[PDB]
Amino acid sequence: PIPTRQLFINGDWKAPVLNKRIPVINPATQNIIGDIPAATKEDVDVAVAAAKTALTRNKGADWATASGAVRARYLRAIAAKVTEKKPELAKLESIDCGKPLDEAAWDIDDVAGCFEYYADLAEKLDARQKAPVSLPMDTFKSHVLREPIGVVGLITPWNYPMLMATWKVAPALAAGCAAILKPSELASLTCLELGEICKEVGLPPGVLNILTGLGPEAGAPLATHPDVDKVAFTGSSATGSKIMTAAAQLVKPVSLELGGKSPLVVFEDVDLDKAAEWAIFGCFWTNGQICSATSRLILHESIATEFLNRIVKWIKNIKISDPLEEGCRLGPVVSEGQYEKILKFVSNAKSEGATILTGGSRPEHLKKGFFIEPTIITDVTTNMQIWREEVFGPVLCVKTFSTEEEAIDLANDTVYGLGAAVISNDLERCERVTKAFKAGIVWVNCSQPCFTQAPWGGVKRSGFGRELGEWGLDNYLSVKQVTQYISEEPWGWYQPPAKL
Amino acid sequence: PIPTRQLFINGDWKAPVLNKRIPVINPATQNIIGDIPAATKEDVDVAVAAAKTALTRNKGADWATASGAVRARYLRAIAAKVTEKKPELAKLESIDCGKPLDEAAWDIDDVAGCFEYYADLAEKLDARQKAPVSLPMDTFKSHVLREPIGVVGLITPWNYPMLMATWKVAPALAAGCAAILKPSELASLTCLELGEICKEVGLPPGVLNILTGLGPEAGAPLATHPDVDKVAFTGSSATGSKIMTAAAQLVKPVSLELGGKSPLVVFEDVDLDKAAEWAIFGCFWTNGQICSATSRLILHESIATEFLNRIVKWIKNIKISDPLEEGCRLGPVVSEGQYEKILKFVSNAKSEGATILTGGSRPEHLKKGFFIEPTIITDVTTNMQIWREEVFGPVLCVKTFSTEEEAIDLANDTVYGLGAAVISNDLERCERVTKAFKAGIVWVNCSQPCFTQAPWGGVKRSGFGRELGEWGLDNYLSVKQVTQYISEEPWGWYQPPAKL
Ligand code: NA
Ligand code: NA
Structure with a gap:
């Protein structure tokens, strides 16, 4: 009943390079019920490279530089697919993490609900581009472009396995990013099944990569990788510190949802x-x-x-x-x-x-x-x-x-x-x-x-940054100021060489 | 000629606890032309406590919970003072950091212009409070409150001494925060003069504290202080890495504008x-x-x-x-x-x-x-x-x-x-x-x-976050979601004890 899967990398299933695997335990019975692949740095390296390529491929035309409405269709199709497999997904969730089935069913409705929410935000995104900035001089014009932040690593906890992953994946994909999702080793079953849904939706290869495994082996290298533009994390304050610590070495933006x-x-x-x-x-x-x-x-x-x-x-x-x-x-x-x-x-x-x-x-x-x-x-x-x-x-x-x-x-x-x-x-x-x-x-x-509509996040020792709502999407967009000199006059700050 | 000043803490001049001082050098002549106070941890401790008290005092009614139009008047008054003292401030900037006087005059215009811009933003902010979030259920209502992020450490470089200080100070004060400014030890003269301007304007005590001194002695304690809500930084990537490293220990938000x-x-x-x-x-x-x-x-x-x-x-x-x-x-x-x-x-x-x-x-x-x-x-x-x-x-x-x-x-x-x-x-x-x-x-x-109207910040190794424009203001505001159950029906998730 419990699926056997590989890592999901570049649109298809792929064995970990070192081929290690870890147990799946059913908390209700304490029995080993299967296993999941255990990714290491060399898997991260492959996944990150795949993410890079997915952003640049065909001038970014299939994903990154496509219009929001194109990404929206992918996200609506993922949502319908989740709704379709609801009975199975909810049962795998309850089996994997131990929450009542009526809770898991609620989670699965909200996964579909979240993808649809961010699909609608993706359609609205195109009209948000080239937002005029009003300037106190008529000799310059300025506007804002909102571009995908790039390659994102997403590191999530087990208390709401599929839903926590979705909270990050949906806005990141809506923004045009390419993601490496690293779910909790204590509950990876439904996130792996997200892989299958990507295959079935025809989501472009490298846009979403799912790497299961131990935190230090599979999560850690996302925060120290030159080509990862941002790490988004939910889990313990202690693990937050470590990831933030590591990211600092490359001044990598990190967002933290903590306890x-x-x-x-x-x-x-x-x-x-x-x-x-x-x-x-x-x-x-x-x-x-x-x-x-x-x-x-x-x-x-x-x-x-x-x-x-x-x-x-x-x-x-x-x-x-x-x-x-x-x-x-x-x-x-x-x-x-x-x-x-x-x-x-x-x-x-x-x-x-x-x-x-x-x-x-x-x-x-x-x-x-x-x-x-x-x-x-x-x-x-x-x-x-x-x-x-x-x-x-x-x-x-x-x-x-x-x-x-x-x-x-x-x-x-x-x-x-x-x-x-x-x-x-x-x-x-x-x-x-x-x-x-x-x-x-x-x-x-x-x-x-x-x-999903409302911003979610903490103050003091509960982390920083907001997920969900419009904030969720904005976490995966980089702001680009474009300022243009439109005067025909020379800048006239430096003295010109005399003519002759 | 060159003013002699103390630290600016809690609305008044105050000697460093260990009374150390450091030289001011004229880069044009190489002469020692005066000195500036050199803060240590114990001065940061005093400044931080002063900022705290400043936010809570009279139930925040003077500053933190006051309306935006009140803070605006303080900001406009600071802007007018800077303009009034332009000739002296521009000359001080040039002597302190070495930039041509015509450049320093331009900086001082924009210092004033920045305060005025954020005053306009502080006013508009009252109307931006209690923004409703639209919910897919008639049984709940939700809105957002935008509150001061709290006690902020602002750490700035020497290439635009007063202007770089202002880019942070103006939005932070407009947002109802209380700030500790740590200017560069290479150019602290104009920032200390901001101290005098705060006294003259009647800015509430503790709302802005100016701590001059060495990076590791006066800047660093800001990033490790349990009572500092956020650190905002501009400078070298190496120093950025260090601040981000330290702040990660208390999981403290940091923004980095780097080279x-x-x-x-x-x-x-x-x-x-x-x-x-x-x-x-x-x-x-x-x-x-x-x-x-x-x-x-x-x-x-x-x-x-x-x-x-x-x-x-x-x-x-x-x-x-x-x-x-x-x-x-x-x-x-x-x-x-x-x-x-x-x-x-x-x-x-x-x-x-x-x-x-x-x-x-x-x-x-x-x-x-x-x-x-x-x-x-x-x-x-x-x-x-x-x-x-x-x-x-x-x-x-x-x-x-x-x-x-x-x-x-x-x-x-x-x-x-x-x-x-x-x-x-x-x-x-x-x-x-x-x-x-x-x-x-x-x-x-x-x-x-x-x-000042347009977002300013980098991608890749140039840091993260955007300053200036409306982004600048949002850096100092915490988002609070307030979601209210408005149905009279019981939640009905759990089985109620039998009525007898
Ligand atoms: Na499990
Ligand atoms: Na100087």
Whole structure:
């Protein structure tokens, strides 16, 4: 059932030069279920060269210098193909990364949705070219051209395998770039299947190249390659640093989407079951593996007790099972390494004097797989590890407040600044807290809903630059100023040689 | 004559903590003519804290959360002061960095012009807040807020002391940020005078801090400070690499405007005198110390002999003297170190078999000061140092071509990609060569003219990001997405606890 593939390079399948391969593990069962190719520098070198050629081939006429509407057709066709293979792609996603099937299906709709969104942006791009710049002199004219930034390396995480890749691939292709996508080794199946869809769409060879493998072996050489114009990255802050470090040696532009410790602030004037559902979605959905997870509950003390009672009840209704099982609302975490790391976060918080209100370990009824109960940790102190560090599992901590000012202070109490959410019936209070949040994304009376139309990214230690929306496309376009002297007069700055 | 000043921190003059100072040298005379304060980490610490406080003070009401029209008035008032003090400021610039007085007067006009431009942009910004994002669902509403990015470190070079400072300071202040400016230790006089102008205008304390000193002592701590939100930099690629390297540790956003080896392509179908003047302006103007200098001449063989003859005639008419002298069209280079570096490029070019068509050493009639004659180097081969490395002095090297395609390949034969220029009466040929240039900035039928209204920055090894125009303002604004659930229906993703 699980496909066996090569690297996708220059329009076709291709064995890694050193022919190495790595396991595919199903997090729900812990069994090895196949393998994926493991790329090295010599594969990067081939892929990058293929990308270069794809940009220059035929004067760039098939891709780079073609009109946006031409690229748009390719992106619409990729979108229709994804929609066609939805049932299979969603199942491979759930198998590969462990998210509930109903989540994977949502992801696959949004992959198609993203390609279509950027296809429409590609059609609008042609009219955006040669944008006049108004000048305070009639002796010059100036305009702007928007050109493909060039060869791009795209390095993505496993929590939303196909979708994270798409967020980068769609605008990059829409802008006329040629991409090397390096998906997470923990979940590469659906990205490899993106290769097949490229073949079936007839996407020009070298325009998209997919290289699976270990981060240091296959990701790292993208950031140190003379012919890579930009690296776009989503994942850990630590890996971000390393990639940014390496790129510096060649002053290569890098964009970083990183993790966070996002706050959800819940005021007293709310429907408790609505606010309880959003809090669970904010921390436990995607099996807690959300970069922008509201993993810190900032809860008005007047309702603390009854909110926590309600939220625990909701947790008890969450069906935790194999992701493919009907009605699944929580799957296993992606891997053994993470499973053990998450539980260590829970025990450390126990060792520091915090209370496990609910959850804390694997569920009793599941013997195999990396399953963890939705955990709520209470009696939490500002200096505890649980409060400051990203857990990336179904683990929420709770602190209480009374004043709006104290809630904001607790909210902004972190080195990160990706997401933030406020829930209150008082809308002027929502706006006030919105403005006070030091985050790139703020949700009002919800937590987590993510639209392709709107800009996505962090402040402080959560990285920089925005993806999605028009920002997403602009990340892959280089701006060229064209300024023209239209006066027939000599510049007249230097003294001319006398005539005779 | 030459003012004596302290650091400018938190609205007032303040001695370095370790009270060190460093000399000011007149490049024209080589005399020590005064001194400037030399900041260290502990001064950066004080300046950074001062910037922080400045953003939060009175709930940001004076500056950060104030309307754009309020910051505009401060910017217009700075612009008026610069204009008022033009004669003294221009003279200070010339004495400090060595550029002809007529050039410094032009810089000071544009300093004022830049503040005025960004004042207009600060006003327009109020109307750009809360821009709605159009959603494919009636159950959510979304918009964007544009907030100050926060505490910015601004690190600038000596070739346009006040103007380069302004390119960063004006948009940063227009965006409601608070800035720490670290000017070049080779030319800090006019930037310190910006300090006095801030006092006189009543700019809120901490909004602009001016820290003079050594690169590693005063600039470097900006890139490693947890409270610095962004570093904006213009200077050498090597220093750029270092700043980007340090900033990566805290995953801090950095923008780099670096040097290049920019080409000028001159086709046979042109007025030789006009083309000659522009080639001189492109390489020898500002004493050849232009990041975007067209330091490689790509000249059509059919006109090569007679073009080179004309350009030599024009060069002989360039008056080279003390920058304050009436009619000066070439001053000394900024420093001894630069002086010696440039002469080494000329002799290394001779050591490799290239010809020195004109210039090559100091002028005979000037016994003191770091003067170098405008230099044309011919018989150049692509592997020569002179062809590939940035000289940053009045040194032009020449190569010949016959076909448009050969000229483009020569033009793009470089790791850099800041600027580029085409001169031809055939405007359709200009457009073709424009599109083909791998550069951020292209000049048609001229070389070098620079407008505040138009985006400025490089591709490849010349850095990333764009300054000036609306791009300049956006560099200092963080994007905040605000997405609000407006449905009264429950999210309905999770199974609710049974009603009893
Ligand atoms: Na897997
Ligand atoms: Na000086």
